[PDB]
Amino acid sequence: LPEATLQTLSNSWLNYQQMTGVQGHIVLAGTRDFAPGESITLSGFGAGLDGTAMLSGVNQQFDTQYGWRSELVIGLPASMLEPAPPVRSLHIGTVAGFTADPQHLDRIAIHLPALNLPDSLIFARLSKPWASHASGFCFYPEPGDEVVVGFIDSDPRYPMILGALHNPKNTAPFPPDEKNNRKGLIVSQADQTQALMIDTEEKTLRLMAGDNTLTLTGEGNLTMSTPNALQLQADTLGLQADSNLSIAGKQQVEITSAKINM
Amino acid sequence: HASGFCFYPEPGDEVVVGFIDSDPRYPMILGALHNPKNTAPFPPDEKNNRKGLIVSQADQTQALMIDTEEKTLRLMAGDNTLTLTGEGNLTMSTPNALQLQADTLGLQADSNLSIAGKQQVEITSAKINM
Amino acid sequence: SKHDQLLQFRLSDWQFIRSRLLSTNCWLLPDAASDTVVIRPLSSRTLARDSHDYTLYEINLNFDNRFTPDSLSLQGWDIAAQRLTAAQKSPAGAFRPWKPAGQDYALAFSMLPEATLQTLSNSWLNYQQMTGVQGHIVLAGTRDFAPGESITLSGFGAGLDGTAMLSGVNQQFDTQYGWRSELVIGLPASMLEPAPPVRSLHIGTVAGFTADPQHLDRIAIHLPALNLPDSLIFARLSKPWASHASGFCFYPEPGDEVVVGFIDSDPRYPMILGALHNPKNTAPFPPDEKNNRKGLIVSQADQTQALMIDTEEKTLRLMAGDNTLTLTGEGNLTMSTPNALQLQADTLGLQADSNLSIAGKQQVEITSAKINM
């Protein structure tokens, strides 16, 4: 959407194409009584050329023969009919702090280093794989992330983040390597790495929180492994094992209940 | 090959589309773009703490969440939260039954344990040692 | 300096040369009557009104200053440092093509064309100087001139006196006028692109593994739009999240058919945007009406291992091959492993409201020091 309402730009293109309809020139002799917006009229002629015409410019043309001849100009040559001059490249930019959207979308304020504008901010749209109605991927990139930005319908006014691009100032959790075994997303603010990992060589699925790993290994074991307390509240929890069980504890073990069967 | 992300967007999602080798005949979805007719689960905010994907069809929000301020990792199903908090606790917290079938499950704790239940507790087995 | 990665993307092969001479501060000097070309960087005979040796007929000279800047301060985005490299301004008054005897241009790219932008900033400032003074000197019949001779005009008035550097010679044999070696001054115009732009989205396959010699994390791909099966092209990877030190980080497999866009319309910088399942790969489930199955999948040979969301059954199932955690909404929760499982904790306390059941076909040990009941 180029402007707020498209009434004026629709009137404006229809008017700049009318000016190509009638165009020509009237070679007069020597007067400064005319201006490029005068709207003169032709009266005494035949039925072909009689009527009011609006000028576009005047040319003076002093020379030795012909004397002085103020040529009048009617009409405008042509028009490109773009809403804005198109930029059709992919550019990259950094995210710029946080600023709320005054247009009440969820647009993320970025920079563009292709512009030499370090002070001014540009709101840009965020593209997610999933998004949805009310259930999205929703990671919303950090304020220094170097996103890659494309422009919708070749208008500079509407940018859009497409990806987010690790770089040597950020240093990604593991480089791309031969034997791509480590996978899984990572979230890590200062010291607490907290997201799931897939190691396809060891056939695992490990949910981190910093020391709380759930690590259900394929064709193998399953372990909560927390260095602190863990709780398992349920309406009626029943745990069952085939042909072995073991319950331990160095200090107290309480089976505190009303009716205990054996 | 045969193992993908595979969310396959819903029929009203407003994707952004680019065209391969400048041909109109071949379009291609690149992103999917929340919007005010959809209303994303949380807006972008200063102090980006809430993260994690969300899947929610009508009422059942069911996906994992990362809250970096509280250092958690919470797997939803609607009331079934697994919420393993970093430098902290771990809790299944389901308002219904839960089962833990295993070939040989052995649970172990260092210097405290507690097993509870308001009604019956059965340790039904063949050979019970103490 | 050696290049890391050029790319000729379906150029004419002559179009590529004079878009590479513009970025190198050189001009061609082609020679007729031979196949020898002397490429020489942008850096006298003294024909005068008094002089008997050369007869002059016409000296046109334009002296324009529309498309002649003074600076060419060019700079580009350094990927490693992220400072948008310091502005290499080029002074006007170096390489003067017209030396008489009596506005600041500035771009910034979202990329980096060469290693240092000193030479390309000098080169655009020099190719715009050649449009400043341009014309032709119609002489009579001599082969004593060449397109790089830098002759001088001496015996004239104060308007046109000074050293001018030629651009070419035209011989013009005809019946009237005899033989007239016309000299040419100045160069017509210039496009001022760092490279001829390709503004399409292309797709390519990932190419094995090769480490990045430029010490980024760029993934070496192919492009089938080129018919180059042997040569490799390093390309940047775009992730949704990435971050400082905590990313999505799946790093696509060597046969994946990614879709590739080019940053700031330069072939030298490609970039993966998506990854595109296809009938040679066969995605885990096709798109269907009643989109219920969701969730990512990782599966190398036989072990499907990632979380699944089935919105019809309201589940969240974490696979490892047989180890499913499957916490179903408004329903149950089950570890379900066909092997051992352990639950180590500092103080684990499990609690249930109004039922409990502990089982085991063989031994059950509650091995501890102090057991209460």
PDB file of C-alpha atoms in Angstrom, chain A:
ATOM      1  CA  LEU A   1       0.000   0.000   0.000  1.00  0.00           C
ATOM      2  CA  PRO A   2       1.863   3.126  -1.234  1.00  0.00           C
ATOM      3  CA  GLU A   3       0.050   5.888   0.687  1.00  0.00           C
ATOM      4  CA  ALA A   4      -2.676   5.976   3.322  1.00  0.00           C
ATOM      5  CA  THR A   5      -5.536   6.262   0.831  1.00  0.00           C
ATOM      6  CA  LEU A   6      -5.041   5.606  -2.882  1.00  0.00           C
ATOM      7  CA  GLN A   7      -7.440   8.313  -4.049  1.00  0.00           C
ATOM      8  CA  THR A   8      -4.756  10.915  -4.712  1.00  0.00           C
ATOM      9  CA  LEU A   9      -2.258   8.610  -6.430  1.00  0.00           C
ATOM     10  CA  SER A  10      -5.084   7.254  -8.599  1.00  0.00           C
ATOM     11  CA  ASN A  11      -6.061  10.806  -9.557  1.00  0.00           C
ATOM     12  CA  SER A  12      -2.425  11.696 -10.138  1.00  0.00           C
ATOM     13  CA  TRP A  13      -1.630   8.952 -12.629  1.00  0.00           C
ATOM     14  CA  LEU A  14      -4.852   9.644 -14.521  1.00  0.00           C
ATOM     15  CA  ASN A  15      -3.888  13.307 -14.771  1.00  0.00           C
ATOM     16  CA  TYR A  16      -0.279  12.697 -15.864  1.00  0.00           C
ATOM     17  CA  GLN A  17      -1.564  10.477 -18.668  1.00  0.00           C
ATOM     18  CA  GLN A  18      -4.046  13.130 -19.825  1.00  0.00           C
ATOM     19  CA  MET A  19      -1.139  15.499 -20.462  1.00  0.00           C
ATOM     20  CA  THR A  20       0.186  13.100 -23.122  1.00  0.00           C
ATOM     21  CA  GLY A  21      -3.116  13.272 -24.988  1.00  0.00           C
ATOM     22  CA  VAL A  22      -2.759  16.730 -26.523  1.00  0.00           C
ATOM     23  CA  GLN A  23       0.777  17.989 -26.997  1.00  0.00           C
ATOM     24  CA  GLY A  24       2.425  20.365 -29.423  1.00  0.00           C
ATOM     25  CA  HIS A  25       3.857  23.829 -29.776  1.00  0.00           C
ATOM     26  CA  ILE A  26       2.699  27.287 -30.845  1.00  0.00           C
ATOM     27  CA  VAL A  27       5.464  29.354 -32.449  1.00  0.00           C
ATOM     28  CA  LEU A  28       4.645  32.971 -31.648  1.00  0.00           C
ATOM     29  CA  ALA A  29       6.687  36.157 -32.142  1.00  0.00           C
ATOM     30  CA  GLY A  30       8.433  37.724 -29.213  1.00  0.00           C
ATOM     31  CA  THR A  31       6.499  38.320 -26.015  1.00  0.00           C
ATOM     32  CA  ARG A  32       7.110  37.826 -22.306  1.00  0.00           C
ATOM     33  CA  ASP A  33       3.382  37.764 -21.509  1.00  0.00           C
ATOM     34  CA  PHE A  34       3.235  33.975 -21.075  1.00  0.00           C
ATOM     35  CA  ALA A  35       4.110  31.506 -18.327  1.00  0.00           C
ATOM     36  CA  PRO A  36       4.102  27.686 -18.101  1.00  0.00           C
ATOM     37  CA  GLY A  37       0.702  27.595 -16.350  1.00  0.00           C
ATOM     38  CA  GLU A  38      -1.383  30.143 -18.238  1.00  0.00           C
ATOM     39  CA  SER A  39      -4.117  28.018 -19.951  1.00  0.00           C
ATOM     40  CA  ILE A  40      -4.615  30.011 -23.163  1.00  0.00           C
ATOM     41  CA  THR A  41      -7.394  29.488 -25.728  1.00  0.00           C
ATOM     42  CA  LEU A  42      -7.591  29.206 -29.524  1.00  0.00           C
ATOM     43  CA  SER A  43     -10.675  30.911 -30.919  1.00  0.00           C
ATOM     44  CA  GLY A  44     -10.576  32.181 -34.482  1.00  0.00           C
ATOM     45  CA  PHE A  45      -9.697  28.963 -36.303  1.00  0.00           C
ATOM     46  CA  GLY A  46     -11.614  26.169 -37.975  1.00  0.00           C
ATOM     47  CA  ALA A  47     -13.448  23.338 -36.294  1.00  0.00           C
ATOM     48  CA  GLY A  48     -10.299  21.237 -35.869  1.00  0.00           C
ATOM     49  CA  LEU A  49      -8.319  23.389 -33.425  1.00  0.00           C
ATOM     50  CA  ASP A  50     -10.509  25.594 -31.237  1.00  0.00           C
ATOM     51  CA  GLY A  51     -10.431  25.427 -27.472  1.00  0.00           C
ATOM     52  CA  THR A  52      -8.584  26.133 -24.259  1.00  0.00           C
ATOM     53  CA  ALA A  53      -5.139  24.539 -23.908  1.00  0.00           C
ATOM     54  CA  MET A  54      -2.918  24.609 -20.834  1.00  0.00           C
ATOM     55  CA  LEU A  55       0.737  25.383 -21.439  1.00  0.00           C
ATOM     56  CA  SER A  56       3.826  23.530 -20.290  1.00  0.00           C
ATOM     57  CA  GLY A  57       6.600  26.001 -21.037  1.00  0.00           C
ATOM     58  CA  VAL A  58       7.965  28.856 -23.114  1.00  0.00           C
ATOM     59  CA  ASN A  59      11.104  29.046 -25.305  1.00  0.00           C
ATOM     60  CA  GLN A  60      12.582  32.396 -26.306  1.00  0.00           C
ATOM     61  CA  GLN A  61      14.891  31.658 -29.309  1.00  0.00           C
ATOM     62  CA  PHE A  62      16.832  34.861 -30.051  1.00  0.00           C
ATOM     63  CA  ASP A  63      18.701  34.663 -33.368  1.00  0.00           C
ATOM     64  CA  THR A  64      19.699  36.755 -36.366  1.00  0.00           C
ATOM     65  CA  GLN A  65      17.097  35.523 -38.787  1.00  0.00           C
ATOM     66  CA  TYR A  66      13.561  35.174 -37.338  1.00  0.00           C
ATOM     67  CA  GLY A  67      14.196  37.884 -34.725  1.00  0.00           C
ATOM     68  CA  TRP A  68      12.724  36.944 -31.353  1.00  0.00           C
ATOM     69  CA  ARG A  69      10.172  34.103 -31.225  1.00  0.00           C
ATOM     70  CA  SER A  70       8.541  33.062 -27.938  1.00  0.00           C
ATOM     71  CA  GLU A  71       7.586  29.452 -28.671  1.00  0.00           C
ATOM     72  CA  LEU A  72       4.867  28.070 -26.393  1.00  0.00           C
ATOM     73  CA  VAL A  73       4.756  24.389 -25.390  1.00  0.00           C
ATOM     74  CA  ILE A  74       1.672  22.238 -24.748  1.00  0.00           C
ATOM     75  CA  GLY A  75       1.673  18.830 -23.097  1.00  0.00           C
ATOM     76  CA  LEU A  76       4.006  16.522 -21.167  1.00  0.00           C
ATOM     77  CA  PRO A  77       6.098  13.768 -22.831  1.00  0.00           C
ATOM     78  CA  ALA A  78       5.571  10.445 -21.007  1.00  0.00           C
ATOM     79  CA  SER A  79       5.631   8.793 -17.598  1.00  0.00           C
ATOM     80  CA  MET A  80       7.068   5.675 -15.988  1.00  0.00           C
ATOM     81  CA  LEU A  81       4.119   4.990 -13.612  1.00  0.00           C
ATOM     82  CA  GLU A  82       5.903   3.549 -10.606  1.00  0.00           C
ATOM     83  CA  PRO A  83       4.649   4.213  -7.061  1.00  0.00           C
ATOM     84  CA  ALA A  84       8.313   4.601  -6.060  1.00  0.00           C
ATOM     85  CA  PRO A  85      11.582   3.978  -7.925  1.00  0.00           C
ATOM     86  CA  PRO A  86      12.160   0.265  -7.462  1.00  0.00           C
ATOM     87  CA  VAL A  87      14.983  -1.389  -5.562  1.00  0.00           C
ATOM     88  CA  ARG A  88      14.988  -5.099  -6.375  1.00  0.00           C
ATOM     89  CA  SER A  89      17.998  -6.337  -4.393  1.00  0.00           C
ATOM     90  CA  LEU A  90      18.320  -8.245  -1.155  1.00  0.00           C
ATOM     91  CA  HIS A  91      19.992  -6.152   1.534  1.00  0.00           C
ATOM     92  CA  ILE A  92      21.122  -6.935   5.054  1.00  0.00           C
ATOM     93  CA  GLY A  93      20.672  -4.867   8.179  1.00  0.00           C
ATOM     94  CA  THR A  94      21.043  -4.962  11.934  1.00  0.00           C
ATOM     95  CA  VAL A  95      18.187  -4.841  14.439  1.00  0.00           C
ATOM     96  CA  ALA A  96      17.938  -1.468  16.202  1.00  0.00           C
ATOM     97  CA  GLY A  97      17.261  -1.733  19.929  1.00  0.00           C
ATOM     98  CA  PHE A  98      13.548  -1.654  20.566  1.00  0.00           C
ATOM     99  CA  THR A  99      10.950   0.849  19.407  1.00  0.00           C
ATOM    100  CA  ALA A 100       7.215   0.219  19.432  1.00  0.00           C
ATOM    101  CA  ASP A 101       5.341   0.351  16.143  1.00  0.00           C
ATOM    102  CA  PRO A 102       3.297   3.568  15.763  1.00  0.00           C
ATOM    103  CA  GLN A 103       1.333   1.960  12.914  1.00  0.00           C
ATOM    104  CA  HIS A 104       0.232  -0.786  15.375  1.00  0.00           C
ATOM    105  CA  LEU A 105       1.639  -3.735  13.468  1.00  0.00           C
ATOM    106  CA  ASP A 106       4.399  -5.906  14.974  1.00  0.00           C
ATOM    107  CA  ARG A 107       7.160  -4.412  12.839  1.00  0.00           C
ATOM    108  CA  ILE A 108      10.717  -4.689  14.142  1.00  0.00           C
ATOM    109  CA  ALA A 109      12.813  -1.528  13.928  1.00  0.00           C
ATOM    110  CA  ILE A 110      16.071  -2.224  12.093  1.00  0.00           C
ATOM    111  CA  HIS A 111      18.940  -0.370  10.459  1.00  0.00           C
ATOM    112  CA  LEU A 112      20.247  -0.657   6.917  1.00  0.00           C
ATOM    113  CA  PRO A 113      24.010  -0.115   6.476  1.00  0.00           C
ATOM    114  CA  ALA A 114      23.478   0.391   2.752  1.00  0.00           C
ATOM    115  CA  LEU A 115      22.149   3.730   3.931  1.00  0.00           C
ATOM    116  CA  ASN A 116      24.631   5.816   5.891  1.00  0.00           C
ATOM    117  CA  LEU A 117      21.948   6.589   8.472  1.00  0.00           C
ATOM    118  CA  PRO A 118      23.098   5.342  11.890  1.00  0.00           C
ATOM    119  CA  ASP A 119      20.576   7.510  13.755  1.00  0.00           C
ATOM    120  CA  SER A 120      17.286   6.878  11.931  1.00  0.00           C
ATOM    121  CA  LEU A 121      15.243   3.707  12.304  1.00  0.00           C
ATOM    122  CA  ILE A 122      13.291   1.673   9.762  1.00  0.00           C
ATOM    123  CA  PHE A 123      10.428  -0.574  10.790  1.00  0.00           C
ATOM    124  CA  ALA A 124      10.423  -3.904   9.000  1.00  0.00           C
ATOM    125  CA  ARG A 125       8.138  -6.907   8.876  1.00  0.00           C
ATOM    126  CA  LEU A 126       9.169 -10.298  10.263  1.00  0.00           C
ATOM    127  CA  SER A 127       8.775 -13.504   8.254  1.00  0.00           C
ATOM    128  CA  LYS A 128       8.412 -16.720  10.250  1.00  0.00           C
ATOM    129  CA  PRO A 129       8.150 -20.266   8.813  1.00  0.00           C
ATOM    130  CA  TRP A 130       4.921 -21.221  10.520  1.00  0.00           C
ATOM    131  CA  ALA A 131       3.463 -18.204  11.722  1.00  0.00           C
ATOM    132  CA  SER A 132      -0.373 -18.957  12.120  1.00  0.00           C
ATOM    133  CA  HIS A 133      -3.536 -17.475  13.492  1.00  0.00           C
ATOM    134  CA  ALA A 134      -2.560 -17.314  17.169  1.00  0.00           C
ATOM    135  CA  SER A 135       0.226 -19.853  17.468  1.00  0.00           C
ATOM    136  CA  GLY A 136       3.606 -18.989  16.005  1.00  0.00           C
ATOM    137  CA  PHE A 137       7.303 -19.739  15.996  1.00  0.00           C
ATOM    138  CA  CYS A 138       7.925 -16.387  17.696  1.00  0.00           C
ATOM    139  CA  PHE A 139      11.589 -15.930  18.502  1.00  0.00           C
ATOM    140  CA  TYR A 140      11.680 -12.175  17.593  1.00  0.00           C
ATOM    141  CA  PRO A 141      15.376 -11.469  16.970  1.00  0.00           C
ATOM    142  CA  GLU A 142      17.749  -9.841  19.457  1.00  0.00           C
ATOM    143  CA  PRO A 143      18.875  -6.205  18.907  1.00  0.00           C
ATOM    144  CA  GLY A 144      22.195  -7.011  17.230  1.00  0.00           C
ATOM    145  CA  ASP A 145      21.457  -9.882  14.920  1.00  0.00           C
ATOM    146  CA  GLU A 146      22.259  -8.867  11.261  1.00  0.00           C
ATOM    147  CA  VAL A 147      19.076  -9.937   9.511  1.00  0.00           C
ATOM    148  CA  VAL A 148      18.712 -10.171   5.725  1.00  0.00           C
ATOM    149  CA  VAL A 149      15.969  -7.905   4.378  1.00  0.00           C
ATOM    150  CA  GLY A 150      13.911  -8.022   1.188  1.00  0.00           C
ATOM    151  CA  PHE A 151      11.443  -5.364  -0.010  1.00  0.00           C
ATOM    152  CA  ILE A 152       7.818  -6.162  -0.884  1.00  0.00           C
ATOM    153  CA  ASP A 153       6.767  -5.238  -4.452  1.00  0.00           C
ATOM    154  CA  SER A 154      10.011  -3.292  -4.947  1.00  0.00           C
ATOM    155  CA  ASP A 155       9.075  -0.462  -2.593  1.00  0.00           C
ATOM    156  CA  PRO A 156      11.670   0.869  -0.112  1.00  0.00           C
ATOM    157  CA  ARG A 157       8.829   1.820   2.247  1.00  0.00           C
ATOM    158  CA  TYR A 158       8.031  -1.850   3.005  1.00  0.00           C
ATOM    159  CA  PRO A 159      11.035  -3.932   4.142  1.00  0.00           C
ATOM    160  CA  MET A 160      10.843  -7.493   5.446  1.00  0.00           C
ATOM    161  CA  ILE A 161      13.219  -9.722   7.431  1.00  0.00           C
ATOM    162  CA  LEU A 162      13.759 -13.129   5.809  1.00  0.00           C
ATOM    163  CA  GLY A 163      16.628 -14.748   7.761  1.00  0.00           C
ATOM    164  CA  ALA A 164      18.997 -13.856  10.602  1.00  0.00           C
ATOM    165  CA  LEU A 165      22.603 -14.807   9.709  1.00  0.00           C
ATOM    166  CA  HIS A 166      25.280 -15.756  12.288  1.00  0.00           C
ATOM    167  CA  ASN A 167      28.598 -13.955  11.859  1.00  0.00           C
ATOM    168  CA  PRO A 168      32.103 -13.767  13.432  1.00  0.00           C
ATOM    169  CA  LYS A 169      30.973 -11.140  15.966  1.00  0.00           C
ATOM    170  CA  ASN A 170      28.303 -13.559  17.234  1.00  0.00           C
ATOM    171  CA  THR A 171      30.060 -16.982  16.911  1.00  0.00           C
ATOM    172  CA  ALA A 172      27.332 -19.664  16.337  1.00  0.00           C
ATOM    173  CA  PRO A 173      27.200 -22.659  18.769  1.00  0.00           C
ATOM    174  CA  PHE A 174      28.948 -25.049  16.390  1.00  0.00           C
ATOM    175  CA  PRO A 175      30.321 -24.504  12.875  1.00  0.00           C
ATOM    176  CA  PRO A 176      29.100 -26.508   9.890  1.00  0.00           C
ATOM    177  CA  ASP A 177      31.212 -29.631   9.696  1.00  0.00           C
ATOM    178  CA  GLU A 178      31.602 -32.844   7.792  1.00  0.00           C
ATOM    179  CA  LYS A 179      29.669 -35.560   9.656  1.00  0.00           C
ATOM    180  CA  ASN A 180      26.721 -33.332  10.461  1.00  0.00           C
ATOM    181  CA  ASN A 181      25.710 -34.995  13.707  1.00  0.00           C
ATOM    182  CA  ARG A 182      25.037 -32.143  16.122  1.00  0.00           C
ATOM    183  CA  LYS A 183      21.688 -30.486  15.437  1.00  0.00           C
ATOM    184  CA  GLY A 184      18.974 -28.891  17.535  1.00  0.00           C
ATOM    185  CA  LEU A 185      18.198 -25.314  18.415  1.00  0.00           C
ATOM    186  CA  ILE A 186      20.000 -23.462  21.216  1.00  0.00           C
ATOM    187  CA  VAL A 187      18.878 -20.567  23.418  1.00  0.00           C
ATOM    188  CA  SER A 188      21.611 -19.138  25.646  1.00  0.00           C
ATOM    189  CA  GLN A 189      21.366 -15.667  27.161  1.00  0.00           C
ATOM    190  CA  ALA A 190      24.476 -15.350  29.344  1.00  0.00           C
ATOM    191  CA  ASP A 191      25.475 -18.793  30.660  1.00  0.00           C
ATOM    192  CA  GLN A 192      22.359 -21.010  30.554  1.00  0.00           C
ATOM    193  CA  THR A 193      22.170 -23.008  27.345  1.00  0.00           C
ATOM    194  CA  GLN A 194      18.521 -24.123  27.261  1.00  0.00           C
ATOM    195  CA  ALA A 195      17.087 -25.947  24.231  1.00  0.00           C
ATOM    196  CA  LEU A 196      16.838 -29.391  22.693  1.00  0.00           C
ATOM    197  CA  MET A 197      19.712 -31.078  20.871  1.00  0.00           C
ATOM    198  CA  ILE A 198      19.799 -33.949  18.381  1.00  0.00           C
ATOM    199  CA  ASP A 199      23.060 -35.861  18.025  1.00  0.00           C
ATOM    200  CA  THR A 200      22.449 -38.233  15.124  1.00  0.00           C
ATOM    201  CA  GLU A 201      25.673 -40.161  15.727  1.00  0.00           C
ATOM    202  CA  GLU A 202      24.649 -41.032  19.300  1.00  0.00           C
ATOM    203  CA  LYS A 203      20.893 -41.129  18.441  1.00  0.00           C
ATOM    204  CA  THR A 204      19.798 -38.869  21.303  1.00  0.00           C
ATOM    205  CA  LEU A 205      17.308 -36.081  22.012  1.00  0.00           C
ATOM    206  CA  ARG A 206      18.598 -33.974  24.895  1.00  0.00           C
ATOM    207  CA  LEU A 207      16.506 -31.213  26.487  1.00  0.00           C
ATOM    208  CA  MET A 208      18.806 -28.802  28.321  1.00  0.00           C
ATOM    209  CA  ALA A 209      18.154 -26.254  30.995  1.00  0.00           C
ATOM    210  CA  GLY A 210      21.744 -25.752  32.192  1.00  0.00           C
ATOM    211  CA  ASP A 211      22.123 -28.954  34.187  1.00  0.00           C
ATOM    212  CA  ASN A 212      18.671 -30.566  33.775  1.00  0.00           C
ATOM    213  CA  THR A 213      18.957 -33.021  30.872  1.00  0.00           C
ATOM    214  CA  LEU A 214      16.224 -35.417  29.771  1.00  0.00           C
ATOM    215  CA  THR A 215      18.398 -37.183  27.101  1.00  0.00           C
ATOM    216  CA  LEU A 216      16.185 -39.991  25.797  1.00  0.00           C
ATOM    217  CA  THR A 217      18.693 -41.952  23.702  1.00  0.00           C
ATOM    218  CA  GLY A 218      17.363 -44.084  20.868  1.00  0.00           C
ATOM    219  CA  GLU A 219      17.741 -47.871  21.244  1.00  0.00           C
ATOM    220  CA  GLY A 220      18.892 -47.033  24.749  1.00  0.00           C
ATOM    221  CA  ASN A 221      18.050 -45.514  28.089  1.00  0.00           C
ATOM    222  CA  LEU A 222      16.042 -42.501  29.380  1.00  0.00           C
ATOM    223  CA  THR A 223      17.268 -40.270  32.274  1.00  0.00           C
ATOM    224  CA  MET A 224      15.913 -37.082  34.000  1.00  0.00           C
ATOM    225  CA  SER A 225      19.363 -36.397  35.620  1.00  0.00           C
ATOM    226  CA  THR A 226      18.628 -33.165  37.641  1.00  0.00           C
ATOM    227  CA  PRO A 227      21.141 -31.985  40.375  1.00  0.00           C
ATOM    228  CA  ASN A 228      18.183 -30.660  42.391  1.00  0.00           C
ATOM    229  CA  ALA A 229      14.678 -31.765  43.341  1.00  0.00           C
ATOM    230  CA  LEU A 230      12.208 -33.171  40.847  1.00  0.00           C
ATOM    231  CA  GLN A 231       8.471 -33.637  41.315  1.00  0.00           C
ATOM    232  CA  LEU A 232       5.945 -35.860  39.484  1.00  0.00           C
ATOM    233  CA  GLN A 233       2.403 -34.725  40.502  1.00  0.00           C
ATOM    234  CA  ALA A 234      -0.448 -36.697  38.832  1.00  0.00           C
ATOM    235  CA  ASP A 235      -4.125 -37.567  39.520  1.00  0.00           C
ATOM    236  CA  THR A 236      -3.268 -41.346  39.597  1.00  0.00           C
ATOM    237  CA  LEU A 237       0.351 -42.013  38.611  1.00  0.00           C
ATOM    238  CA  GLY A 238       1.263 -45.619  37.967  1.00  0.00           C
ATOM    239  CA  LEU A 239       4.837 -46.585  37.158  1.00  0.00           C
ATOM    240  CA  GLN A 240       5.480 -50.072  35.833  1.00  0.00           C
ATOM    241  CA  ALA A 241       8.557 -52.032  34.848  1.00  0.00           C
ATOM    242  CA  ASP A 242       9.061 -55.470  33.335  1.00  0.00           C
ATOM    243  CA  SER A 243      11.174 -57.847  35.446  1.00  0.00           C
ATOM    244  CA  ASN A 244      13.304 -55.355  37.424  1.00  0.00           C
ATOM    245  CA  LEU A 245      12.805 -52.296  39.606  1.00  0.00           C
ATOM    246  CA  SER A 246      15.042 -50.278  41.901  1.00  0.00           C
ATOM    247  CA  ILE A 247      14.192 -47.450  44.293  1.00  0.00           C
ATOM    248  CA  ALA A 248      16.975 -45.808  46.251  1.00  0.00           C
ATOM    249  CA  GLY A 249      17.939 -42.919  48.499  1.00  0.00           C
ATOM    250  CA  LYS A 250      20.778 -42.453  50.959  1.00  0.00           C
ATOM    251  CA  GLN A 251      18.702 -40.720  53.639  1.00  0.00           C
ATOM    252  CA  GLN A 252      14.949 -41.022  54.383  1.00  0.00           C
ATOM    253  CA  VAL A 253      12.430 -42.829  52.177  1.00  0.00           C
ATOM    254  CA  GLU A 254       8.781 -42.091  52.975  1.00  0.00           C
ATOM    255  CA  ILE A 255       5.817 -43.901  51.423  1.00  0.00           C
ATOM    256  CA  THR A 256       3.482 -41.626  53.436  1.00  0.00           C
ATOM    257  CA  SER A 257      -0.132 -42.530  52.665  1.00  0.00           C
ATOM    258  CA  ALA A 258      -3.386 -43.651  54.249  1.00  0.00           C
ATOM    259  CA  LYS A 259      -3.669 -47.240  52.991  1.00  0.00           C
ATOM    260  CA  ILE A 260      -0.438 -48.940  51.911  1.00  0.00           C
ATOM    261  CA  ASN A 261      -0.691 -52.355  50.266  1.00  0.00           C
ATOM    262  CA  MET A 262       2.148 -54.745  49.514  1.00  0.00           C
TER     263      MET A 262
END
